């Protein structure tokens, strides 16, 4: 009867940010206060509505996007931000009405030699529109010569790995990020 936020927040694996995940929260009641007190979060910033104010509101759908990035980039998960993530991987709209939660995952997403499971998009011909998901892997032309889909000089594979190591600084440490988005439609609202 109540929303299964644990499936998203306590999921054993998280997504590469360039292939960021989305889960649909439907037909349930959302306690956005127990959620504030579910654990210690590095970030719990809402844009448009407070948690208590949200406890007294109802929306059609609630999307829970989840992925992993590094510390210095959590900033970019906000309206009006620029950087590798916001420009090329995960873009929040300026008019964003939702919440951004993030916590430190170094204890789970780093390995001694480096963890290369998590990729991000390094190059792109243009910035992302809001909530766009680019999982293409076209060779990126960085110079004046066209690449013809051949990798080579200034013709790059567009993805790149973080390589999380436990001994990195926190700015380069892995953080798990859950963006909650609120969908209000002309249809029966089912999440309150």
């Amino acid at each position: 009867n109540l929303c299964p936020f644990g499936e998203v927040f306590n999921a054993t694996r998280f997504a590469s940010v360039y292939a960021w995940n989305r889960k649909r929260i439907s037909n349930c009641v959302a306690d956005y206060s127990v959620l504030y007190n579910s654990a210690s979060f590095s970030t719990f910033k809402c844009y448009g509505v407070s948690p208590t104010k949200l406890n007294d509101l109802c929306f059609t759908n609630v999307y829970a996007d989840s992925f992993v990035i590094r510390g210095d980039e959590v900033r970019q998960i906000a309206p009006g931000q620029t950087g590798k993530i916001a420009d090329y991987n995960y873009k929040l709209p300026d008019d964003f009405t939702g919440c951004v939660i993030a916590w430190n995952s170094n204890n789970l997403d780093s390995k001694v030699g480096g963890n290369y499971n998590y990729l991000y998009r390094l190059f792109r011909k243009s910035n992302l529109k809001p909530f766009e998901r680019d999982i293409s892997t076209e060779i990126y032309q960085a110079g004046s010569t066209p690449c013809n889909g051949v990798e080579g000089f200034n013709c790059y594979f567009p993805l790149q790995s973080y390589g999380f190591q436990p001994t990195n600084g926190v700015g380069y440490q892995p953080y798990r990020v859950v963006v909650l988005s609120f969908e209000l439609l002309h249809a029966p609202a089912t999440v309150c």
Partner: antibody
Amino acid sequence: EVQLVESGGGLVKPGGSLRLSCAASGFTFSDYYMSWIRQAPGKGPEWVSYISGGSSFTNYADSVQGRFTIYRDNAKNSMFLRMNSLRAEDTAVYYCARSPPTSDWYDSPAYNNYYMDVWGKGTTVTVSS
Amino acid sequence: EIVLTQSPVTLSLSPGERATLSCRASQSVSSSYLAWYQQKPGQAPRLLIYGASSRATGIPDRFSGSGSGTDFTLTISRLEPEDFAVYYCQQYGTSPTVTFGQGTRLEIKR
């Protein structure tokens, strides 16, 4: 008919690279986990890497971490293994293999069927001075 | 990491006989998530059984899998000449990584 065809193997000096390709046909490529599994001369199969149908999830054998990158392209019905800094002990036949699927998720983290129901013929990688 | 010990290393039997191949795990395998594969020289492995006892599609009834926890067995009730080959077990339950056994080679006794 379901088929997987690997290519891109070869001989390279230690420290070289290869770009392995796996072309799939006969099924909805996008719905299936895809994996690379290697078999050294005289040995049994060894899991190398996997990627989920939506590319959200990736994992690697501890011994290739940071040298091999797995990715896929569902529009080309294909997946790939970028191998760099090759070492002599990476010599083996490399198979791409499919795992079957179990949905409010783009790429559901609840997935445990990491067995391989379809394999390609394989492609040979030899790393030697 | 789960270690799968397959035995014996080489099994010598005649056609028509029953073959039993053992796969023991160094720790319990969750949900019986244990698969078996057959491989012929110069060929890719092919799946025989998943979930310890589920027969893969197109596999003959003479192949059956059983077991749970740390104890798994593949039985070939009536050996045909095409069944003589190498067999691998593979764990895939609640472990950091999928793991394979080192194989049991079934050869023709004469």
